[PDB]
């Protein structure tokens, strides 16, 4: 499952693979009564955030 | 003296959902509310005098 091409710059091509980078952000998290996280909103996306 | 945490109160059974990595329970005072016995792995509770 490794075919060769030259895809880049906002394309879509099967890889069975993902990667992303982290940044310093502040989050507001809620805890359910069971103690399980269910919702979270980051403060630096939109004015509504 | 549960591995530290000097205090006083009443100890009773609880129905918490302490995950295998979860050790200490807190309320909104930064004061302990539930603790797990190191020697038996049981979910206790602390109630003020």
């Amino acid at each position: 499952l490794t075919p060769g091409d030259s895809s880049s710059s906002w394309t879509a091509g099967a890889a069975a693979y993902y990667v992303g980078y982290l940044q310093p952000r502040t989050f507001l998290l809620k805890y359910n009564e069971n103690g399980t996280i269910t919702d979270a909103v980051d403060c630096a996306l939109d004015p509504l955030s | 003296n549960f591995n530290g945490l000097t205090g006083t109160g009443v100890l009773t059974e609880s129905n918490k959902k302490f995950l295998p990595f979860q050790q200490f329970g807190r309320d909104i005072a930064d004061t302990t509310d539930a603790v797990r016995d190191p020697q038996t792995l049981e979910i206790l509770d602390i109630t003020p005098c």
Partner: peptide, 28 residues
């Protein structure tokens, strides 16, 4: 097959090892 897509909402992980319940704690 380098390609670009969207991440949506993913990557929330417990920032601490202390039990909470019905709390709105926020961390940076």
């Amino acid at each position: 097959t380098q390609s670009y897509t969207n991440s949506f909402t993913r990557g929330v992980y417990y920032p601490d090892k202390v039990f909470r319940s019905s709390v709105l704690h926020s961390t940076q």
